[PDB]
Design an enzyme around this catalytic site. Structure first.
Site, short mmCIF file in Angstrom:
data_model
loop_
_atom_site.label_atom_id
_atom_site.label_comp_id
_atom_site.label_asym_id
_atom_site.label_seq_id
_atom_site.Cartn_x
_atom_site.Cartn_y
_atom_site.Cartn_z
N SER A 1 -8.13 6.17 9.21
CA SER A 1 -7.67 5.35 10.33
C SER A 1 -8.32 3.98 10.22
O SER A 1 -9.53 3.88 10.05
CB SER A 1 -8.04 5.98 11.67
OG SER A 1 -7.51 7.30 11.79
N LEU B 1 -14.22 8.61 -2.90
CA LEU B 1 -13.02 9.40 -2.66
C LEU B 1 -13.08 9.98 -1.26
O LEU B 1 -14.06 10.64 -0.89
CB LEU B 1 -12.91 10.53 -3.69
CG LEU B 1 -11.76 11.54 -3.52
CD1 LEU B 1 -10.45 10.90 -3.88
CD2 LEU B 1 -12.01 12.80 -4.38
N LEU C 1 -4.76 -1.35 17.31
CA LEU C 1 -3.94 -1.96 16.26
C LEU C 1 -3.96 -1.09 14.99
O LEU C 1 -4.18 -1.58 13.88
CB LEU C 1 -4.45 -3.37 15.92
CG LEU C 1 -4.38 -4.44 17.02
CD1 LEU C 1 -5.07 -5.71 16.55
CD2 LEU C 1 -2.93 -4.74 17.38
N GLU C 2 -3.69 0.19 15.19
CA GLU C 2 -4.02 1.22 14.20
C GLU C 2 -3.06 1.25 13.01
O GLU C 2 -1.84 1.36 13.19
CB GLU C 2 -4.07 2.61 14.85
CG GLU C 2 -4.59 3.68 13.89
CD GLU C 2 -4.89 5.02 14.53
OE1 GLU C 2 -4.67 5.21 15.76
OE2 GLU C 2 -5.36 5.91 13.78
#
Length: 201
Positions: free
Chosen positions: A131, A125, A170-171
């Protein structure tokens, strides 16, 4: 089921840019996401420290967290997709911080086995936002842990790269308080990384 893995940067940027155009994020939501890319370590750190409870945060941070959360009402992946993340040793625990790596930059095989016992076939968790990138970008190539997340069609997931303060990642952002299951853990060819495959819940 099968998960789309992008193998080309231009292909990934094109798909992501197309998704971003459809979101219709508000002015405030955009502002909150920009700020997240500048301050993600602080925000995710506070979420972890407080186990997701935002009541004690300064009022501007409460608003920001709420706007990020709300943004995911508009940001879903249209297909099964693979996302990538790099992490440093402390991601596995305090006990791995100065033990996971030997002096060669190669993963200590004993520590690797302990990490496998701790995490393989188990849920994790995450209180912070996650990101990720559409590819295993060179940015987190120095990092000893690479995770590949399998994210199902319709799941909350947003290509925020177009408004990030930083370039080349390329987030794709995933929501906070997400659970994932570690399916596979193995050493890379050259022994310098642990590759983790996980299924997002």
């Amino acid at each position: 089921n099968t998960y789309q893995e992008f193998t080309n940067i231009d292909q990934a940027k094109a798909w992501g840019n197309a998704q971003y155009k459809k979101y219709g994020l508000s002015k405030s939501e955009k502002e909150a996401i920009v700020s997240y890319t500048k301050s993600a370590s602080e925000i995710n750190g506070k979420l972890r420290q407080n186990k997701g409870v935002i009541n004690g945060f300064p009022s501007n941070l409460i608003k920001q967290v709420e706007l990020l959360d709300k943004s995911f009402n508009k940001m879903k992946t249209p297909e099964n997709i693979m996302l990538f993340r790099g992490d440093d040793p402390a991601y596995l625990g305090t006990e791995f911080q100065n033990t996971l790596l030997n002096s060669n930059g190669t993963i200590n095989k004993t520590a690797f086995e302990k990490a496998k016992a701790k995490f393989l076939n188990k849920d994790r968790l995450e209180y912070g936002y996650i990101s990720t990138s559409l590819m295993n970008v060179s940015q987190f190539a120095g990092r000893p842990i690479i995770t590949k997340f399998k994210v199902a069609k319709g799941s909350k997931a947003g290509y925020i790269d177009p408004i990030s303060a930083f370039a080349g990642q390329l987030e794709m952002l995933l929501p906070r308080h997400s659970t994932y299951h570690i399916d596979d853990m193995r050493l890379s060819s050259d022994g310098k990384q642990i590759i983790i495959t996980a299924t997002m819940m």
